[PDB]
UniProtKB/TrEMBL annotation, chains A, B, C, D, E, F:
The gene is gag. Signal peptide: none annotated. GO terms for biological process: viral translational frameshifting. This is Gag polyprotein. It comes from the Viruses. Coiled coil: none annotated.
């Protein structure tokens, strides 16, 4: 990785942490913030190490590769590399494959990340990887938020847990997700608790809603 | 985080510690001092990492988000950002969303935390998060301090353990909590030990009270 | 903590070590030297973190708080804070609550600990905490040193183990404890071994005593 | 290893990580990216330590030695060492055996890796080792990609997992591997899902293919 | 401890290592080299921490205290402290109790250990502690080297293992121990192997002796 | 140890690693490369710590001591220490016992290892120790390479694993070992696979041999 800026190899306990999360949690939504945290300051080499050390889930990993390739192609379309001898004082322009670590060396990565102004190829590539992981997570979610409905004897807290767990894995903007919160959560509550929530009125907070249906 | 002041990514063993505490203890009161200790010097990015890596308890986590949003809105009301080009020597004013790490970069956070005088957005955001966790803890407590009563054969030490465990999760100021100590603890003691505590008089220390009812 | 002098957050493995000791050993006497070792160089914030992260034993923890409050009050009586504007070059006088970390910031603590001459508020507060833990340990000891008597078939080494274990938890000065060693250990030995120890004479070392009763 | 450039002995937790991976996973394909990650910045001494600390799999390890010897011989053929006294300011040319760490000292390795321009003998040797590990991995794979066929009731995601797992261990260029993807994956799908994939057309992405056969 | 020379608190994993060794191995001879290794560079405070964190074995620990007190008294007899005001540039002379960490501060220890020429109170105290541990080890050994005799069907390697294990815990100089090796090992061998060892002659090495009795 | 060159105590996790390897693997051949890796940069004190912390295998450990003593004696014969006052600017010549850490201090070791030109007593002593461990390993091997013969139904890969495992523990030069490879491996193969290997011809690589007998 790179520490604040000096270069350092990815740590054995970072590597083990990532392998373990994937083995135990598959692509549960919290896997993505864990990936991002484990890869703070990471070069594209480090990111590839993390992705390559995953054993199994090879369908997912190959979908990830496809997403990265799509983003790399769009990068090249927006940022064409010009043919010409690079002058002594300078470094070259990164291609999609350079951002993904496939056609760049560590030194070239290091060069872009530390050169002023910074070309932050690790952060750009991590974005692409996260875009791919989001697709995988939505793939691994069996359920739609529209199907999260409160059970007849289900405590409201348990329903809310299921609701927001599902909502986390939905492909939707924050605007769409806000609409799902403000719409579906109350609509799909069970008859007894729903009646109580309506009497609170339409601008009550989640704390107040959860406390309201605690007795029932 | 930031070490005393140089920037450092949140550690794999810090991240694992937090995930584990939440899995094993849910929102027992001691979870909050653990959160605070694990997040010493933390940037808002680090704090969000910690909150985002929690799997399950999604009702709680969404209540936390609501509390943060309320505090962010109050920040903006008190501290309005002015429209204008930021001069070269300066950095901009943080909004609520900048404190919460949602609209700021690590570099902007770092800039505020290290610039003189310091704008300590990590410490401000940690406060908001703790305010949210307090609500969650009180939610997760099933019991009121008013219902902690000594059992007929319960050793006094066991009663005191239950009393202060419950008291820790109460929403009350230190003044209200002092009143609960000075009032309820003796009043809700069992008949035999209560008689003994009254004969000690009204300004005896907890050590003396606990020793007094050791034989009984 | 503070390393020799640069400031550093309390470590995840220090925090975990303390939590684990308390869970597994309660307030066995060796818990106190472990606390002291884990808190080397600690600021009052670090000490409070350690105390606050203990789950359960809330009667003990509240007794600890009482002892700290007593020591804080005595500090204020001996060292009154004077009302007045602190000049630019200086820092203010710590109150009892500043030593306990309740009314001070980390920076103020850091200021006192590093300023020349040093006001070592971490070491002062750790003393108060240890005074409180001693009371707890004596509370958790069921037994008095006067009741440690050698069994009819108990190997002398086993008796000596029980004797010094109990003696460790006694509230007594070193003079009182010396008297208990020189008096009770031989007096409460079993008839056969006691006869043998008297024939050694009255100034023989523990090694010699233990070897003398090895055959018997 | 070497940290960015200061020399450091290979760490106990790096060493243990490597031993453990090999014990648990044998030569599953992900073992190679793990080896590469654990050996970032490694000198030939470190690489030999890692290879020598593997217990069992001695047939594999001896095949690895053969591959290294072949690459060393080709190095010497391309880069002949010249007989002559090395002048004071300079260091000597590495032979195949110097790259493999067998006839060089740590200081000589260090000298080549840090001297300007760098002779990166650790990176060159790691390449040779990886070439050997690839042969071992292909040896340990029982199956050919041509024999990965979807079962009559096998969910498509499970078939894709088996397909890319097998493909990872194949000796084939990226061009050959692309042909296997674009050819075999669809051809060896089961009758029901194959019909559905053809109706998508011939330039649909893996995400779309996997979603298409989710119901079936 | 002190690192080469900057001061550092004793580490949580050092502390845990020591506690664990004692719990699991009691005072097996290898406990002493482990103690010495864990305490490299240790101040008397660190050494006391290690000794104080041992739970149980209180008879042993009290014998250790007696040995330390004896060595402290002999120190004072050889090195009397002179009464007088210590001049500004200087530090004072350590007493026995200062070496044992009982009447000195960390700063005083640090002062002696780092001042030129060094007064190495940590190394001196560690010696005294090891002297005490040796007595404990010999106490915990049930057996004398004179009673280690080869069994009728015991492989010679097993006899030699028992012999040197016992010999390690003996109180004897290297001269006495050499005599026990050169004398007892062959004399206490079983009839068949003893005959074979005599035919080797009297200056054969242990390797040769052990190989000689491998078939028998 | 010594880090590249600053002195550092041997780490708790290094110490634990060594103890564990010996407990679990005894003197399997891979124990020696592990010892060497764990002792990178080690002073003779560190090496002795490692050897002394081994519990059990005391016959082996005493054989190790004999080998070290033999090498020390040969050192003294080749390098006689001269009697005379060492001048201020200089340090003295190491004896055999100084290399083994028995008659030298850490400072003297440090002095030799860091003085220019370096007298690398840690590396010299580690050599002697490895010579001793080799003897132990050959002692612990029950089997001769001449007795490794392929079973009638044993897969060739399993035979090759046994062959090279045994070969690793043989006392033989690389020339003798090459002869054993080129001679015994094919000669001791089972009738069916042997016939197939001869038809490959006499200069085929191990990969090709192992693949040839995969079907059979």
């Amino acid at each position: 990785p790179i520490v604040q800026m000096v270069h350092q190899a990815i740590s054995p306990r970072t590597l083990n942490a990532w392998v373990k999360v994937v083995e135990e949690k598959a692509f549960s939504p919290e896997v993505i913030p864990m990936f991002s945290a484990l890869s703070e300051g990471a070069t594209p080499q480090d990111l590839n190490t993390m992705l390559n050390t995953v054993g199994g889930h090879q369908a997912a990993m190959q979908m990830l590769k496809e997403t990265i390739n799509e983003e790399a192609a769009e990068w090249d379309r927006l940022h064409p590399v010009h043919a010409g001898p690079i002058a002594p004082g300078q470094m070259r322009e990164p291609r999609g494959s350079d951002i993904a670590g496939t056609t760049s060396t560590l030194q070239e990565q290091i060069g872009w990340m530390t050169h002023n102004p910074p070309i932050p190829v690790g952060e750009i590539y991590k974005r692409w990887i996260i875009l791919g992981l989001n697709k995988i997570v939505r793939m691994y979610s069996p359920t739609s938020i529209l199907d999260i409905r409160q059970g007849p004897k289900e405590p409201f807290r348990d329903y809310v847990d299921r609701f927001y767990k599902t909502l986390r894995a939905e492909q939707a903007s924050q605007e769409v997700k806000n609409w799902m919160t403000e719409t579906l959560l109350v609509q799909n509550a069970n008859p007894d608790c729903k009646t109580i929530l309506k009497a609170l009125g339409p601008r009550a907070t989640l704390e107040e809603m959860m406390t309201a249906c605690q007795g029932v």
